Each structure stands twice: as structure tokens, then as C-alpha cells.
Amino acid sequence: DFPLSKEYESCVRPRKCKPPLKCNKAQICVDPNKGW
């Protein structure tokens, strides 16, 4: 298992992005209320 990245960081699995940050098509960390 890999550690949780921070805001605006790679999310390429198995990598993950610590919440509430969510991963999108850009496989990156971006808050759900950022406007994406």
C-alpha cells in the first residue's frame, strides 16, 4: 500500500489522495468544491 498524497498531487493508482480531496480524470488531488 502507498501513502496518501496531498492537495494537487499525483493520484495514479494504487496511489490515492487524502480526503476530502477527490481524484478526477487528471488523476490528481482536487477538492470537490474547487470547480472541476
Taking the domains of the chain in order of start, what are their residue ranges? 1-36
Radius of gyration of the chain (CA): 9
Amino acid at site 14: P
Which residues have C-beta within 8 Å of that of residue 3, sequence separation ≥ 6? none
Beta partners for 10? 28
Solved by what technique?
NMR
| Cα 17–chain centre separation | 3
Task: State the residue for C-alpha cell 476530502.
Answer: 20
CA distance 29 to 3: 13
- With 0-12 / 13-18 / 19 or more C-beta atoms within 10 angstroms meaning exposed / middle / buried, residue 31 is middle
Residue 14 φ/ψ region, left for φ over 0, alpha for ψ in the -120 to 50 degree band, beta for the rest: alpha
Angle ∠(8,23,6) on CA atoms, nearest 5? 35
**Do the Cβ atoms of 2 and 14 come closer than 8 Å?**
yes
- With 0-12 / 13-18 / 19 or more C-beta atoms within 10 angstroms meaning exposed / middle / buried, residue 6 is exposed
